[PDB]
Amino acid sequence: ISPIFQGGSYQLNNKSIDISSLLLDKLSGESQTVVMKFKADKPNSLQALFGLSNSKAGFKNNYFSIFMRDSGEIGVEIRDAQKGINYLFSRPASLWGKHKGQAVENTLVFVSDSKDKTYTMYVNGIEVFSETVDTFLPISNINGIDKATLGAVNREGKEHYLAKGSIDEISLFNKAISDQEVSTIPLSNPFQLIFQSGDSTQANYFRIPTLYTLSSGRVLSSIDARYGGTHDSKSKINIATSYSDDNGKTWSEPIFAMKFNDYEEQLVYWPRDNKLKNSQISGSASFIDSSIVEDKKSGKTILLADVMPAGIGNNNANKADSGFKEINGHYYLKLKKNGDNDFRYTVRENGVVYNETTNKPTNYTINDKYEVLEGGKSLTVEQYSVDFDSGSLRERHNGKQVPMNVFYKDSLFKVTPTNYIAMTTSQNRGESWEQFKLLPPFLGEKHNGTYLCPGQGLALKSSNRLIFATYTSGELTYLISDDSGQTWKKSSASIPFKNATAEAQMVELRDGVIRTFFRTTTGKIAYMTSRDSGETWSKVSYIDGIQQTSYGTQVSAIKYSQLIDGKEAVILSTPNSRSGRKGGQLVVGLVNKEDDSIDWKYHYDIDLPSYGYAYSAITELPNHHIGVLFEKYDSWSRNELHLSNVVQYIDLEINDLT
Numbered sequence: 001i002s003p004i005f006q007g008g009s010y011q012l013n014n015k016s017i018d019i020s021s022l023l024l025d026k027l028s029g030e031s032q033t034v035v036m037k038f039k040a041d042k043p044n045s046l047q048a049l050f051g052l053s054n055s056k057a058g059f060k061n062n063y064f065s066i067f068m069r070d071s072g073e074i075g076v077e078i079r080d081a082q083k084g085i086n087y088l089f090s091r092p093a094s095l096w097g098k099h100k101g102q103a104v105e106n107t108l109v110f111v112s113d114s115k116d117k118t119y120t121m122y123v124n125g126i127e128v129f130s131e132t133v134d135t136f137l138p139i140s141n142i143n144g145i146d147k148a149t150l151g152a153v154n155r156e157g158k159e160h161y162l163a164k165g166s167i168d169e170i171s172l173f174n175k176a177i178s179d180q181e182v183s184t185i186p187l188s189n190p191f192q193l194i195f196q197s198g199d200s201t202q203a204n205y206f207r208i209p210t211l212y213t214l215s216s217g218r219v220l221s222s223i224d225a226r227y228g229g230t231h232d233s234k235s236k237i238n239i240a241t242s243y244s245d246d247n248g249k250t251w252s253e254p255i256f257a258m259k260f261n262d263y264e265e266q267l268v269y270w271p272r273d274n275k276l277k278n279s280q281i282s283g284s285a286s287f288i289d290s291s292i293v294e295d296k297k298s299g300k301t302i303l304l305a306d307v308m309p310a311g312i313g314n315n316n317a318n319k320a321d322s323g324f325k326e327i328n329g330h331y332y333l334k335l336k337k338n339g340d341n342d343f344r345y346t347v348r349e350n351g352v353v354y355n356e357t358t359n360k361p362t363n364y365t366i367n368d369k370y371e372v373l374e375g376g377k378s379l380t381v382e383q384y385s386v387d388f389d390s391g392s393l394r395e396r397h398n399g400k401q402v403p404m405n406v407f408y409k410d411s412l413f414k415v416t417p418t419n420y421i422a423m424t425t426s427q428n429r430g431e432s433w434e435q436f437k438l439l440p441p442f443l444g445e446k447h448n449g450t451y452l453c454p455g456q457g458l459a460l461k462s463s464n465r466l467i468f469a470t471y472t473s474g475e476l477t478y479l480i481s482d483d484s485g486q487t488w489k490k491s492s493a494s495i496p497f498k499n500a501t502a503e504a505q506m507v508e509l510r511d512g513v514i515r516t517f518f519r520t521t522t523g524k525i526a527y528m529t530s531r532d533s534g535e536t537w538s539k540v541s542y543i544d545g546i547q548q549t550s551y552g553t554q555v556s557a558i559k560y561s562q563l564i565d566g567k568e569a570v571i572l573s574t575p576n577s578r579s580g581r582k583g584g585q586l587v588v589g590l591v592n593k594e595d596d597s598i599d600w601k602y603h604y605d606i607d608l609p610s611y612g613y614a615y616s617a618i619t620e621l622p623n624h625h626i627g628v629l630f631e632k633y634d635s636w637s638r639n640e641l642h643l644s645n646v647v648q649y650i651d652l653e654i655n656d657l658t
């Protein structure tokens with residue numbers, strides 16, 4: 001339908017603009033819609049963009065406002081002193097500031113719906129909150145309102161929450177427009193969603209993006225399909241992949257590389273209140289940290305991820321056990337039968353389940369899918385679902401059978417409660433994925449296996465060598481295969497660090513020369529160097545000019561195919577901040593052919609220094625553009641947990657970076 005008020009081209013330079021004369025008398029009915037197209041690339045700490053208020057002395061808590069923070073958060077206040085109502089809804093990390101040097105036109109649609117008693121906020125096509133209340137306070141029904149205001153809120157004759165920005169177009173509707181009509185509002189977005197709430201994954205949250213340009217020109221992406229908030233394991237997580245055959249313009253409905261079925265693929269809205277936000281799915285198996293590589297020889301695509309059995313993760317993973325028993329040179333998967341006190345079982349070749357205590361083979365075997373068969377008949381357990389209907393998290397049997405899996409809670413046979421690493425392969429460049437296979441241990445029978453570094457493996461351009469970086473305490477454990485990932489060996493490389501999330505990524509500077517950038521605990525990104533195509537590694541050094549917080553963040557790195565300023569070019573993707581995960585950057589480095597030193601020459605801010613930027617993925621697209629798929633939020637902060645559609649893709653060209 002049609003607007004009751006329409007204005008635009010408003011400049012908010014720390015002075016409010018009065019539109020009361022024009023707007024107020026047009027207000028009528030108890031449901032309303034706001035449509036605001038605005039820019040803020042130098043926001044103040046906290047500012048109102050728009051406000052209906054009672055400006056009369058002693059009614060300072062009678063106003064509606066649409067406010068933002070310089071961290072990118074958006075919200076409304078709906079306060080009526082005389083109704084004893086002070087509503088406040090918001091979601092951190094909902095905005096854009098700048099892109100390619102230009103102010104982003106952000107599009108905001110707030111719906112106040114008096115029949116459903118529900119407020120709803122959209123920003124650039126993304127629903128960022130939807131709240132129902134017992135008691136609806138219409139924004140036009142606030143007692144004694146007498147001002148409509150832009151760039152401030154007029155309380156008691158003074159300008160509160162003064163804004164620095166601009167509102168290019170604002171519209172108003174004495175109606176609560178439908179979710180469908182919203183979608184027909186044109187957007188001016190500089191980003192895209194690859195995976196997204198409501199897609200085939202049916203996961204509401206995504207984390208840990210990957211990107212990898214296949215040789216056909218297909219660009220591939222994997223990611224954590226995180227169901228139980230954005231928590232790490234323990235939780236439910238699946239690995240999902242999508243691809244683009246058009247240089248990152250469009251992307252395929254995603255499929256699963258790695259998946260478990262003990263728990264329903266549920267789309268939950270995870271509570272963001274302090275009392276509940278640390279609810280955690282606790283009985284589910286899960287995957288986490290995918291990394292991708294393409295093998296030149298067989299043509300196959302290879303994808304690895306950390307694997308976690310039911311209830312298990314970083315903090316409670318049985319260290320001092322690999323989960324395997326080594327009998328005569330070879331490694332065998334340990335199991336525990338229901339009702340035992342110990343792992344009196346192993347999984348030998350062709351799956352056969354052996355009781356160790358009597359050395360006898362049993363009637364059970366283990367299929368490719370790590371499923372249990374008895375007598376060659378596959379057993380089933382019941383699926384679980386979760387809900388917050390009782391008010392806390394509740395995990396309950398949903399009356400649906402699924403094949404029994406040795407990683408599940410209800411399995412007759414259970415793996416060792418620690419962390420593993422699995423691979424899968426695609427023969428069709430991400431249109432399907434084979435059943436995953438466990439990698440063997442590398443650091444011994446009595447050590448929990450390492451941790452996969454999420455991102456890309458390196459395929460060495462002049463050999464058949466495939467390399468996947470992993471980390472554990474004290475060292476980067478590189479995983480080398482020269483036979484299409486059919487067999488693996490480890491190349492260890494000490495680092496001056498204990499208990500670091502030493503997430504490592506590699507570039508090939510020239511044939512056989514691998515430099516690996518990695519996350520530390522010192523606030524500075526580290527690096528090392530191999531010159532035998534990964535056989536041995538240098539001591540550790542650090543980068544100056546880039547800053548990270550003490551706990552640090554994953555860093556993505558690539559070898560640019562083209563020469564820049566006449567020199568070999570490396571590109572780095574990372575937050576540049578000592579305070580949190582924000583101030584995203586692409587940093588371009590030229591190599592010194594004399595000593596292999598890199599001169600960090602160009603810094604490109606992905607968005608404002610105060611806007612969240614976390615885990616990231618970078619690829620060189622077949623048209624030589626650069627694709628960036630990243631966590632556009634502070635995925636460390638406890639205040640920005642459980643946001644939907646914050647992993648975003650952008651397209652960049654080199655000249656944008658310089």
Ligand SMILES: O=S(=O)(O)CCNCc1cccc(O)c1
Pocket residue numbers: 232233234288289306313314315451501553635636
């Ligand atoms: O905590 S973050 O730095 O945001 C991400 C860490 N992910 C590490 C990890 C790997 C495997 C299992 C986990 O529970 C956790």
